[PDB]
Amino acid sequence: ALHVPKAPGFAQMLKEGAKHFSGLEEAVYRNIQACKELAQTTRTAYGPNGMNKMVINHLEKLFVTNDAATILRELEVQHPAAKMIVMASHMQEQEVGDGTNFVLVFAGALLELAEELLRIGLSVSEVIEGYEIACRKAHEILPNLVCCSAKNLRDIDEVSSLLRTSIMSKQYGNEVFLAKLIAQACVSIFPDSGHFNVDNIRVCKILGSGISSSSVLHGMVFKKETEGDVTSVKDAKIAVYSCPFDGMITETKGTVLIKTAEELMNFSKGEENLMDAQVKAIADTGANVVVTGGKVADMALHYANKYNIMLVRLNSKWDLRRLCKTVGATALPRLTPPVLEEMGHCDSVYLSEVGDTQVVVFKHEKEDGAISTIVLRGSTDNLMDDIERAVDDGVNTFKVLTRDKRLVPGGGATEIELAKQITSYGETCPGLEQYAIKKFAEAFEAIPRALAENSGVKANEVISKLYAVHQEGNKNVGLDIEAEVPAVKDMLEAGILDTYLGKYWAIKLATNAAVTVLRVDQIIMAKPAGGPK
Amino acid sequence: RPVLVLSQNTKRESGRKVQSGNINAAKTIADIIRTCLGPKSMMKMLLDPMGGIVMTNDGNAILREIQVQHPAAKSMIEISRTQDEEVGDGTTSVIILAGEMLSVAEHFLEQQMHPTVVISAYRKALDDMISTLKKISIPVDISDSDMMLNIINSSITTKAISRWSSLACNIALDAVKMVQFEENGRKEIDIKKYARVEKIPGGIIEDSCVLRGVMINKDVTHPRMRRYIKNPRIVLLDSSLEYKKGESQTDIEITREEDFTRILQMEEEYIQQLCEDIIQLKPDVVITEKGISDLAQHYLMRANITAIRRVRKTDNNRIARACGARIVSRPEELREDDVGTGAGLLEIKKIGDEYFTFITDCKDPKACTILLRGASKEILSEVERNLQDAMQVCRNVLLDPQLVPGGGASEMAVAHALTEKSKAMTGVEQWPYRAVAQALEVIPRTLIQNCGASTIRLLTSLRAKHTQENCETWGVNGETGTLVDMKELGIWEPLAVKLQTYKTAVETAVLLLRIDDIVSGHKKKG
Amino acid sequence: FLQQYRKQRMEEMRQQLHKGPQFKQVFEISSGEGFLDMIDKEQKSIVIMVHIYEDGIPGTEAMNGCMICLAAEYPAVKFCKVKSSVIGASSQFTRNALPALLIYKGGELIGNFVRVTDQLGDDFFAVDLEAFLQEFGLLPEVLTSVRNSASEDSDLEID
Amino acid sequence: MAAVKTLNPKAEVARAQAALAVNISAARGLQDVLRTNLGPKGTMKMLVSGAGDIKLTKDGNVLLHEMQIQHPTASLIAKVATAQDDITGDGTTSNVLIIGELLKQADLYISEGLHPRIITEGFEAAKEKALQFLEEVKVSREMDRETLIDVARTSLRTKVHAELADVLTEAVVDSILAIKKQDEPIDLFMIEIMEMKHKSETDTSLIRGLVLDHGARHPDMKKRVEDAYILTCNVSLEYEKTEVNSGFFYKSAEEREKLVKAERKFIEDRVKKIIELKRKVCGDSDKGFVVINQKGIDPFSLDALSKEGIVALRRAKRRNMERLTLACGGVALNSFDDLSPDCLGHAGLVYEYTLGEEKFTFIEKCNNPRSVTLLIKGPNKHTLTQIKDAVRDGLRAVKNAIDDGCVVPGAGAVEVAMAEALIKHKPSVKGRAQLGVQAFADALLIIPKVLAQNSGFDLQETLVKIQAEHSESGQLVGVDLNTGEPMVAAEVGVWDNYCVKKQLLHSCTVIATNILLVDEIMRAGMS
């Protein structure tokens, strides 16, 4: 009478390291608690007043940022429910590019209120049904909350104003300058054709002179040097070769068979003459810059130097295609001279020196092209990485604007209006789903509450003021950050707007993650064993 | 430091203790499978060291999965394997008999009788047992299919397949009959090589059947091949239909520009020549034990020929036997005789989620495939074991058409005859003779025990019944525990199985009786 | 879909019918000097595989059965087993190096696999470990009735 | 202790009633775990593997495989369920439940000193009677679209959420009707299942064509072709080394250049044949040319093909040869020795979709595609896996419904009717096998019991209501999972595959009979 044996049946047959969680209080509440913990550990980095977090991964690499997706990626999350919510956040990042913190906060609040509903007596199925109905109602309501539209994407000032809000949460202190840079870079890209490619915006990080000295370049910058002695070309005629700058050889086996002395004494001379002829044929087509994807032979380099040809060696083939796209050339497979149509033209190619880094710059004087490079300066690698993440957020916001031009007010105004409307709708519906609908509406309060908490003011007073104003009839009113007391102001007048499509996708993904977590009733975890990766 | 004659790990024991240990180990081996005999036997679950599960009630299948340290038990297991391989039936009976004779020999070894006298008495009793069995046997007309089916049924009433008895009996009889071959004045059955049993989990057991041909788990090499041919002409090959290196080192030396292209064109032309040699015989199906090149596939398909590659050698031999073909290595030596005509249908159909190739309408085939479809893998393995037992019994009857009454009737009759013979020796070896004669009653005893009836009353009644004149066929009903004549119940066994059981049991007893010393621990020294 | 290895199932089926007489067991080394004088002894041209294990650790019995099947199929190789504690391994070996595949050839190591659970699994089959060993070319390249082998006087005739 | 332990001291043996107790306990544990899976109202289980992969499932087979159990009887039940899923594709949870309840009911009588042999005899007699009843109760109906829709819903609602179940039902029924040929067995290899990870679960649909997981490997390839000629080939368009160890021998740089130029004449000739065919079939820019190759294409041939406006794909799946020949209507070629326009398929639209680092190629607007594809779209990997398993189950159910000429009412109605018939037939069976027949009937009654329990009602009251209604009216009445009152399953549209029911009966009876007869679990392969 000193030990409790394992119950007969499944309990005994379970493996030594396996874990079995079943029922409501042993599985659902534990999953909800884990998701709440994840939401709590990410909450403080929300909004313009969000705080960066120093995250060190298992490889001792240091990340400092307030991007929720990056923070979740760099955290070794082990709980399966938190893993699912992180997957939802990553899907939101992939689909849109901004709103990951919103997804996580909304999912956490939804699961918290779901636990509360389950405690008061509601069932899992009824909670899920109410959440789905309320999500459908929110998706129906959302288009009516649209304030204005982009109505122009070729204007630098309009695009900068639109993109300021997206990169205002990150790098709150200096967002106008970054907005102008990203606007110029995006407007250079995005030609008359409606398609916009995010990959066409390149970012180069050069250390030394602070982020305020960053600049946008209509072209490409490579952190390399020139093989030859020519280091500056003013009327470049780039010829791009996917083959090494060397005489091509066979593929089975190359064996030189010598049977007479004359062949032995003439082989090297003939090879040199052939290489000289090939290089001179390349040069006679007006080419003065040659970019190769392979190695550069000594003889080829010498003969290129003789004819004043600038040699650049790009090892990575992604950079090769990017250069072909930005200059307007074709990567030749052989060392033949390039035909007129295959010749790439860049207005100026030169070897420069920024900070202490040797770079080769393909520069276009025209304010257009296919690929634009943002040269990021700074005084720390981590700071430059954070600025690059902000630039990525801005570019993704521009891409979303190209996809859909509708905008909704930010600063929690959209969330508060959605909460009010869904709460009003929930009164009409009878049955047990009204509680779930009201809880779904109340889960929208976590966004203005998080903003108020991060801004340093009382969240309850801000929420009450927002409800009072929205009940009056002003549906475009959010909290004012630049205030020491709880205050609200019009978001439309202040220009604090976020994309409608991003909010739509974020709400959908958060609701799906919450209901998917709720549907789980039993957990059968295998023994962890090993598997570091 | 120490000096020894033998090695340190060499352990030796001898005397009455060794004989007692050997006999105890044999009795333990017998007791392991004692309850797995008779129509009312219960199955056993065996866990393989590899993780597999064997669920059966066969003596050899149970015993081959047991690892033992006592060499007497190893001898008994080898005896079980010998009985299984020689005749295919009577595996539990021989083990039980060996245990009983060793027990009744231990009884005499406790006294002052030398083991050699017991062995001589055992050999004399074995000779008399053979004589009595040959005397009480009856002939069988192999032409009568009903009698053969009844024999197979009596053979498989004690296995898990007995619930589907007519189907299993017909399958075994048909397979054995159609695998029978007679070439160059030599008669062979060859159940081991041909008549392959292919089991596919799923379906119902009643859907199982024996095919008039061979089924293999292969699919056509290309989608545009025909998956259904009415009367195909089949050609079987060994060599690959692809360009391959020679044996000698044959490096080339290319100096002209066109030599590389010429080499490639010659490779393609060689493939085309091989395919043309195949096509010249105008076949419909080509089967190869090795790979077939894609270009070879195209050239064959241009002539509307279905090709299957990478078939096992055993499967190819079975196909050749079934469809009357001849395997040809070099395609240029193909003749009209080598082409296999006789297959009445070829079909590649889908079973579950896998493709299977059927050649299942052959006329006069010498090979077959038994298609087992059951609940799971273990059930199908047990069904395959039972079918193997049935086919072995059928082959034994076909080779020797002598028949012997079953259910312990033959053993009780032999015991009574041997006792009557012993009533006249008047020597000193008569006691072991009579003891080993009466030791045959263990199998009627265990039949009664498994039936659950009273052992003593039934055994006494049977022994009294066998003392009459014409009562050699009186045995025990295995599922009701009553004394019934076996010319009414119909349970009969082949004479070969009984002869092998008695010979093997008596010789095992002799072998383990001839031993009184055990030395162990020495290295193999090799 | 060539990764599914359809031949693996037929190879396992053929391995199930490996031998008739017995499954045989992996030799258990009882001492260190026994280990030394069996690795040093025997022909150097044969591959000797040594199995390192301790009782109770998971991931062992599966590879015991795998080596049993390999010894059944392969008569040349000399699969053997020995307790980890008997040799006297250190604490790190006894805590994170239980699965150890010691391969001997020519009197020296040619295969030194340890911590093979990630690359093999926990309940892997014989074919899986066979393929794993074949990945490095570690595997060297009828059924008699029972036996055949029975001075040097052979035969003559009349002369 | 026993004989084996005497012979092998390090052996584990369970003997006589011990074996029965162990087997029945294992079966009861498996049944207790898998009870909550049955029915659309069943709970969803989450499985985490050793590496940390998350899987959401409701299948009996999937749950069994990823359930950390190392039991012999559980292994036998898992093998039976695996065979059931392999052949029929449905009924795994019902299989496990029926086996467990058969063993429990048999134990109920065995614990009273009764021999298992009589129970097995009763089981086999009841199995024969139940098979006869199933033959006499099946609904032989014409498999029109509505019946297939009903069956597909009956499966997918049990597998996934209601709206996703409806979407998958439409997709599965449409795909099966698309690939089906009259009086010809349905080949399920012709329905390619592709997974995308960018949209919601409800965005999955059916493409009347083919979707490929690889795209063009040349940046200058056309990203969209309207009218496409499809060339399905299995010819290597990359450089191939000679089999007989050729090697090159030259004496000057000019000779080396000549040899380099002349070593590609074979592949250049094949590409020239392709280009000549393309120029012959389409002399304008209206019709595009698409080449799908099972083997790789080197950059030189890729550039040569792209210069002619030809989009080319390489390293295609082996089954894609048959899929494209059946969908586009062309002829798969293993060599360009004699190629004509009659070997070219047609595709009314070919475009490429880019998703992350993966490039997908779409082939729509075919004339009468005999092979279609199912695009699985979801925000999560586990969602994709669950939808794929549900689609497999639904496809198997629809194929079974098409194959058999009949369909059996579900919702536990057929099991209740079988139990009633077995109870009626019990007096006919002689001997003490009547107890086995009664145990078989009670075991068959597990399905409505578990359905009612999962729906939230009480087993006994609901079961007696169903039985009383069936006895009074004679209609095949089953459990209504929303109200609990009996409903005519045929009228509502709750259909079960007849082959699934027959396989369930056969396999469950066989495995229960074989397990009940085991009297010794043994493990002596060591030492």
Ligand SMILES: Nc1ncnc2c1ncn2[C@@H]1O[C@H](COP(=O)(O)OP(=O)(O)O)[C@@H](O)[C@H]1O
């Ligand atoms: N100047 C501002 N004043 C008030 N609220 C702001 C301001 N700028 C941004 N926000 C709010 O911050 C939110 C953006 O939070 P953010 O940190 O970008 O999360 P995520 O990266 O997940 O989108 C928006 O919903 C917006 O309403």
Ligand SMILES: Nc1ncnc2c1ncn2[C@@H]1O[C@H](COP(=O)(O)OP(=O)(O)O)[C@@H](O)[C@H]1O
């Ligand atoms: N219906 C029956 N009634 C009585 N005895 C039977 C019956 N059927 C078979 N037997 C006996 O059972 C024995 C077969 O048992 P079995 O399980 O095959 O053991 P073994 O494999 O050693 O022959 C035969 O010797 C036969 O005499």
Ligand SMILES: Nc1ncnc2c1ncn2[C@@H]1O[C@H](COP(=O)(O)OP(=O)(O)O)[C@@H](O)[C@H]1O
């Ligand atoms: N909408 C429904 N109403 C009533 N009964 C249903 C409904 N859908 C399914 N069922 C019944 O519930 C059972 C579901 O079994 P299922 O979970 O598919 O087990 P398995 O996966 O082993 O086939 C079926 O036998 C069916 O008769």
Ligand SMILES: [Mg+2]
């Ligand atoms: Mg943001």
Ligand SMILES: [Mg+2]
């Ligand atoms: Mg027998």
Ligand SMILES: [Mg+2]
């Ligand atoms: Mg189902």
